[model samples]
Target: TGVTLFVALYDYEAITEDDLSFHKGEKFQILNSSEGDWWEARSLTTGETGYIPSNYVAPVDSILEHH
Candidate 1:
């Protein structure tokens, strides 16, 4: 219900300590992804914020249509 939300398409493991690790089907609030392939997101389950791979997620708006 905000700017942009994303859902994980695959389980992602944190390669670096600064990256976010989330399992498939998890939702996240996108902070920003304007610079690189790595996007900044905050996990809805844990409220943890970190850089995640952009390709691993899909926009929640496209997946869920609310009327």
Candidate 2:
């Protein structure tokens, strides 16, 4: 439970070689999203860093209420 993950909403395969590919329900910690269409996030499950679409994920704080 570190930074909330920018969870994947659907199966996303990278369109380019430089992009990151992930499947649905995978967890990621977003480091930044100030770029074009791709946002940089740390893949929580994989420990790899890459670019993904911002629409592919939701804010963990906004989606869940931990008690």
Candidate 3:
């Protein structure tokens, strides 16, 4: 896989059913963007893993500046 980037838009609470319901302001890398929209992402808070939307993600360089 040539992909090397991915992102999360929210902190996303990991449910027992295994769904990524984000927390509104959390972000993370995908490690492989070519896999498609539903890629595996690791949670920064609990170190958990789950699937996320690729469209909601952006490259580090393409992100808007916060000022």
Candidate 4:
């Protein structure tokens, strides 16, 4: 299984001014990079979470295992 790793390269912003929650392995973008690499991001579909690692997301096409 040779899959490519496509990490999220976009920063997402919060549409509504509300507290957001992000789950592990959740895909997100960096909206505001005030706190270093970490920024406020929201779910593109769910609109959840407040802020998360701007470089903590991976594309669906990306694979974690190389076998």
Model 3 / residue 62 / CA error / Å: 3.4
Per-residue C-alpha lDDT of model 4 across residues 1-67, encoded as one tens digit per residue? 1132224444444455553444454455445656676566556657564655556566555555535
Local accuracy of candidate 1 as per-residue lDDT tens digits, 1-67: 3477899989989988889999999999988888799988999999999999999998887766745
Question: Which candidate leads the pack in TM-score?
Answer: 1
lDDT of 4 at 37: 62
Q: Each model's C-alpha lDDT?
A: 0.89, 0.77, 0.55, 0.51
Candidate 2 per-residue lDDT, tens place, 1-67, comes to 3365667878888888666899888888877766777888888887888888888877666656634
- Enumerate residue pairs that collide in model 2: none
Candidate 3 pairs with clashing backbones: 6-30, 10-26, 12-22, 12-23
Q: Pick the candidate with the highest lDDT.
A: 1
Worst lDDT run of 10 residues, candidate 4, spans 1-10
lDDT of 3 at 56: 59
Off-target runs (Cα >4 Å) in candidate 3 are: 1-16, 31-34, 64-67
